[PDB]
Ligand binder design. Structure first.
Ligand SMILES: Nc1ncnc2c1ncn2[C@@H]1O[C@H](COP(=O)(O)CP(=O)(O)OC[C@H]2O[C@@H](O)[C@H](O)[C@H]2O)[C@@H](O)[C@H]1O
Ligand SMILES: Nc1ncnc2c1ncn2[C@@H]1O[C@H](COP(=O)(O)CP(=O)(O)OC[C@H]2O[C@@H](O)[C@H](O)[C@H]2O)[C@@H](O)[C@H]1O
Ligand SMILES: [Mg+2]
Ligand SMILES: [Mg+2]
Ligand SMILES: [Mg+2]
Ligand SMILES: [Mg+2]
Ligand SMILES: [Mg+2]
Ligand SMILES: [Mg+2]
Lengths: 182, 182
């Protein structure tokens, strides 16, 4: 029961990102061209907290912004993979870490005006580094460790620029306080 | 001092959204094709709160997701427009409302892996409807009014799916409590 009717869907690019340009007939009966990254597609974001109340984060180059951003480890959910499995896999690839319990947090659409992608945040407990990272060609980042108090001070000061990381931290906060880690 | 060198930048689309495919030489010295929405580009998001402690929100169709989402009014910052002016303009266009003070909240990148866009959140005080909305062709939404207690209950329950709206609410919360509106 979509309010907009498909006239024609054109694929603008298939790789490395799929992008479409769709001609639709809108609620006004007129035509409009809408450009977007089609679904279904998802990514998992994971805040890895150690038993010492610290977080394992990454400082990662994000080319579209030209900046290195402080982020929680994250990555695309592969075909047939569950969000939790992608979270654990990306945590191992980007930080070389494993964790015990993963508490799922509220999923969200980072930019629904342009992409169908759903981001799945998780709070990983008893995180620990166990192996060297295995980064993809295209991934330029370094992992670091910060006390949770410092990470949340950065959040309060408005210094966390990556939206997904900021939101994951806000959703994780009550759990961290409940568990006695913050 | 970018870690990646431009080999060639190709424009994939110019309108309604500008998209590029850039061939770069990475930190490994190898080539990679990176697809993204180039900057500089920005949008403003504004949580409009009334003197009665209610919020003026929108339920808007977001085609890439196929869903109607509960969001704060928001829109692109036009050429030569300041983020605050875009916030006031979009608030008037989408909800037919005006406000007094606008408190700027921490800016953020909704999806730095794909777009350079910076989102600028604001908390607008003494919001009030004064005129009919003036929606663009392509904008399918309705405005509504909800008590702040209900909006924040939805946030806590993980029911706010739009990331930018969720983050704006989290950043606005301390200000609302300070001002006595929550
Ligand atoms: N826009 C792009 N264009 C070309 N190549 C790209 C792009 N985005 C990511 N890559 C490649 O993603 C890799 C392994 O990535 P994730 O660790 O899986 C990816 P993560 O990068 O942390 O991102 C999460 C998300 O933001 C959204 O754009 C995505 O849906 C998403 O997965 C890198 O080596 C990048 O070069
Ligand atoms: N991907 C798209 N493809 C084709 N047409 C589009 C697209 N996105 C928005 N529009 C048009 O934006 C209008 C006026 O929009 P905003 O009220 O200005 C826009 P807002 O829609 O609320 O969005 C804020 C943001 O999310 C990010 O994608 C943007 O940078 C951004 O501005 C609508 O009528 C849409 O059809
Ligand atoms: Mg990643
Ligand atoms: Mg990956
Ligand atoms: Mg990765
Ligand atoms: Mg809008
Ligand atoms: Mg606009
Ligand atoms: Mg608008």
């Amino acid at each position: 029961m979509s309010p907009w009717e498909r006239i024609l869907l054109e694929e603008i690019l298939s790789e490395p990102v799929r992008l479409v340009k769709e001609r639709v007939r809108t609620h006004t009966g007129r035509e409009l061209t809408y450009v977007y990254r089609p679904g279904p597609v998802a990514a998992s974001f994971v805040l890895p907290v150690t038993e010492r109340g610290t977080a394992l984060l990454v400082r990662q180059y994000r080319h579209p912004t030209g900046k290195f951003l402080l982020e929680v480890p994250a990555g695309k959910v592969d075909e047939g993979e569950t969000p939790e499995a992608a979270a654990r896999r990306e945590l191992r690839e980007e930080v070389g870490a494993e964790a015990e319990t993963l508490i799922p947090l509220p999923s969200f659409h980072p930019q629904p005006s342009f992409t169908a992608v759903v981001f799945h945040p998780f709070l990983a407990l008893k995180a620990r580094v166990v192996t060297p990272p295995t980064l993809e060609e295209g991934e330029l980042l370094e992992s670091l460790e910060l006390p949770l108090t410092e990470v949340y001070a950065l959040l309060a000061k408005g210094e966390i620029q990556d939206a997904s990381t900021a939101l994951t931290l806000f959703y994780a906060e009550p759990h961290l306080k409940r568990l006695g880690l913050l």
